């Protein structure tokens, strides 16, 4: 596509945009400001780069932000540019999780891409590095950059490490745990406020392979990163030097005018996608890799994952699914070790230019292979499962496609009575107040898609109380949101067309015989098709849950789920 | 209205949001986070501070708002508090005026509300105090309060001190100016670039009566600022103590639970229109109350500032207007004082309840009245202009509105043809060229709307081109958009429905004549209603300039001038 969004440049300039104000005596007037805040007319001659942090501190992941942004600002200076540190909002799932805060969550991500797009359109930025250090920040980040199409480099701010108490480690699924084992009898009081105390030993994004460590590795995949910035846990001494190192990287970036579209492309898309199912990432990377497909041109469809995951096998040991985080990846060869596997078993498009101003071949060609006898990456041989873990399904209730992360241990079917929710809310109720009602049932909690819930928020609790009631593979789960965590059995989120949408989903009634099906694909309804049309004809849209302030722009603007979310066309 | 937007808490408890986070056991992720970032078990029970910057590097107005925000947490703390530190973006007028980049300013407003917003709302903080420094940051801080209805005060970053150099002062219009005068003869090259160089000597937002103070002023009038926030300097030592003593009056407010919208009212809504009228006032002001009253709930109209203007008359003699800045304003008591003038005056409500928990009244009762003999604040007896400079215009082609700065100075009446430019650069080619030709005639920027432009630019070369061409008094000038400066004669903005809407504006074709009356308070056409409607019925839209990005959000959410250009409606 021929994205018209952001100001074009009035060959091989340096400063092809900030030319804009610091040359023409008609800006007389910026050069006043630019001299008020401290630029020599020496200094007026130079590039002018945005560096745009997330810092905040109310979250672990973004509270040492701004000392990584002092870092990357002396970079760009000991490299000859003129650097201008600006920071947007970010929101934390983990403090909001559980909580109507989760609405504004996913949006967020869209609001941080609308954010630096403005900085970098209004201040004639000529290219910028994000340091965003958390979930819905890194693919805000990449869709700014890929809407202003200027040379740009997104910096990880790093994962936190694991917590450690008495030979016991914890992470923030520890804190989640903390309260079911509590009400189980697993744990007593005083060890449940243990591991509150424990689980979030310092700064940095969550410690398991999670959206934030999905998106931070995929985008690295993507050429986007520097090699070993997903990698690098945020208190790591290296993760400074690579922010004094942006700078270097990104001058020769624009000396080669390297922008996000040259290296944001159909095979670097398609790389990306690839770490994500060797790795076992989370199903939100569906969302934001087609945000940022879409962001720089280009189209992505859920059918383009299910192909590379049927391409690609899972092979990484990491919770949520398996055992190690992502310390124990930098400990065994980071990143660029992992990705060097990938890409000499073929997996992988080598010839796509990144960041360092190379091919991923040439970045990955001398860096130091997986640690010899590493039990993380399995190999080829030996996989955790022979396909990904990321599975498409289109059957009558999902018409538009719906997301599932599937193991290969749960079966290949699931049928049941539907047993109907109109939110969280109930759902949990109804469990609590009588859990061997949802034995054997196709649990669907419907009413939290992008307009419905609204923000298509993230659930954590059902699963878990699943899970706690003992029907972990006795029970199924859908939903038009996402749900964190996983059952033992079938759970399936962004179902669409949603249901606040008037999709099959807001049509299903409690005794309705649900069958899915993952080898055929499809999950279907024993109602008849013509049954399911009168339902629809005399169905009516609720009313939505809000009438002012970000959250009824977002009903207003947003695609759906399998457009991933956009917002912006 | 019956705004919903925000989650509303789980009587007198200080924690009424993060309670709902830091109490339920079924919370624990949450108080995991709050331990890692910093929060003892005791630091949990307290409230909890959403500390909202808008600092941002490459401009003077807001480089220095992050040590601001270092006093605000710190007197946050002092007061028994949390304070979590969080910062959006801003965009600089001075920088991007005369460019593209100017259509991502007014939106800058809008997104700053969106911003902060989703942060309080995500973390679930009991209250906020905002750090804007900067023209459209000031509205949109006030907008989320407004929407949130927590406790807020907004702490004004301060203006910035005139420049001076060599017994000559200067602030950024001397800048905008001096382009202008270099091509005109009237000074040199090394004369426009002194000018330059000693414009802008430090922190601050811009020195006159502009839209940053006269939004810092209104807001002050309006309650939600602590007395003398808009008037102390940016630099001074005083802004830091009153940084350090928000934390106390937002404790204060807590205990009282005064919200938002017990403070902004229709009264002191008329209260910060009365700062505006009295001032001299930028007609942006008429676009931020308005999106001011909506965030509440409240309606105001165009007609409510045509009444307010008609009962106030212009008082000050500051610039652009006039001769004095707003340092000078401090220097004899300050907003306070001129406030405390126009109360005793009868022209405000002193009943209205603000942030320092008392009402306006109980305020100013014991500030310092005006300094004996000050020559700024004319007398009730000897005004500038005996009613507001603010005036509305509904003629055949304004129906639904306009916007003008009037003086009295004018005449009554402008008569002419129209010479009508698609934008802002096709006009001042033809200005450049054939200056001559606009002598007479009522010359129509159109295009330049809230979807035109996009983002309703502010355009300040017309009017400049035209007092340097000798027109200043022979022409007149009316766009969709808006202009920065004043003519000697006739300019209006806001012209609504703006062209790309179908608006007669829209509709107008060169040697149309056009006669603005101010009296009768009409910009009409001699062309005939049913000639005007022949043109209606063959007009059609123009393409949008912009297919993506927050632009084309912005084009799909904006409201019309006349309704303040909110978006979340
Ligand atoms: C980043 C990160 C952590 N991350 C979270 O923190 C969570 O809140 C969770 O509970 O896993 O939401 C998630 C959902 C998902 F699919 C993958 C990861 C997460
Ligand atoms: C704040 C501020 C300064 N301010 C500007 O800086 C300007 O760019 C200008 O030239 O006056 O835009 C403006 C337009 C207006 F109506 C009032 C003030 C301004
Ligand atoms: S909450 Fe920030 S990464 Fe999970
Ligand atoms: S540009 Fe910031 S106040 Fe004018
Ligand atoms: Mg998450
Ligand atoms: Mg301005």
């Known amino acids: 596509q021929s994205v018209t969004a952001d100001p074009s440049p009035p060959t091989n300039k340096l400063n092809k945009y900030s030319s804009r104000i610091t040359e023409p005596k008609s800006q007389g007037g910026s050069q006043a400001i630019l001299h008020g805040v401290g630029l020599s007319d020496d200094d007026l001659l130079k590039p002018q780069i945005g560096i745009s942090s997330v810092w905040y501190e109310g979250n672990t992941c973004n509270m040492h932000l701004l000392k990584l942004s002092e870092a990357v600002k002396e970079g760009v200076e000991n490299a000859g540019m003129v650097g201008f540190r600006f920071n947007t909002i970010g929101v934390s799932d983990a403090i909001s999780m559980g909580t109507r805060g989760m609405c504004f969550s996913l949006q967020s991500r869209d609001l941080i891409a609308d954010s630096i797009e403005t900085v970098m359109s209004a201040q004639w930025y000529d290219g910028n590095i994000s340091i965003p250090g958390c979930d819905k920040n890194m693919p805000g980040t990449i869709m700014a950059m890929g809407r202003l199409n200027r040379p740009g480099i997104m910096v990880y701010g790093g994962t936190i490490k694991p917590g450690h108490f008495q030979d016991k480690t914890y992470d923030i699924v520890s804190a989640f745990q903390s309260y079911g084992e509590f009400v189980s009898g697993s744990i007593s009081d005083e060890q449940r406020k243990t591991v509150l105390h424990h689980s979030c030993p310092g700064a940095g994004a969550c410690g398991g392979m999670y959206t934030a460590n999905t998106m931070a590795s995929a985008i690295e995949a993507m050429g986007m990163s520097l ?8 208190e790591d001494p290296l993760k400074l030097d690579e922010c004094r190192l942006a700078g270097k990287y990104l001058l020769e970036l624009l000396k080669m005018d390297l922008k996000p579209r040259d290296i944001i492309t159909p095979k670097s898309l398609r790389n990306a996608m690839v770490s994500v199912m060797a790795l076992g990432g989370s199903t939100n990377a569906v969302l934001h890799l087609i945000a940022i497909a879409r962001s720089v041109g280009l189209e992505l469809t859920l059918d383009d994952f299910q192909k590379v995951s049927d391409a690609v096998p899972f092979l990484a040991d990491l919770k949520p699914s398996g055992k190690y985080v992502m310390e124990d990846i930098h400990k065994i060869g980071g990143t660029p070790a992992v990705l060097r596997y990938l890409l000499e078993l073929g997996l992988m498009d080598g010839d796509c230019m990144t960041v360092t101003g190379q091919t991923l071949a040439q970045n990955l060609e001398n860096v130091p ?51 109907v929710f109109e939110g969280e809310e109930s759902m949990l109720a109804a469990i609590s107040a009588d859990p061997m009602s949802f034995k054997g049932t196709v649990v669907v909690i419907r009413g939290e898609g992008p307009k419905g819930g609204p923000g298509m928020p993230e659930m954590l609790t059902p699963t878990s109380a699943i899970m706690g009631a003992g029907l972990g593979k006795e029970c199924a789960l859908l939903t038009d949101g996402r749900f964190s965590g996983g059952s033992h059995g079938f759970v399936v989120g962004h179902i669409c067309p949603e249901a606040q949408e ?30 399911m049309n009168d339902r629809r004809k005399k169905w009516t849209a609720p009313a939505y849950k809000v009438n002012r302030g970000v959250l009824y722009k977002y009903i207003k603007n947003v695609q759906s789920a399998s457009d991933g979310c956009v917002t912006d066309e």
Chains 1, 2 share one sequence.
């Open 502 to 531: 008037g999709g099959p989903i807001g049509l299903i009634k409690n005794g309705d015989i649900i069958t899915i099906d993952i080898g055929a694909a499809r999950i279907d309804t024993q109602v008849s098709p013509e049954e």
């Open 227 to 234: 090699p070993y910035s997903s990698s690098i846990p945020a």
């Open 369 to 419: 292979s997986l640690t010899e006898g590493q039990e993380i990456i399995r190999p080829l041989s030996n996989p955790i499962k022979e396909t990904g873990h990321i599975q498409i399904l289109r059957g009558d209730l999902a018409p538009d496609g719906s997301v599932a992360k599937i193991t290969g241990k749960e079966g290949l079917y699931f049928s049941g009575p539907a047993l």
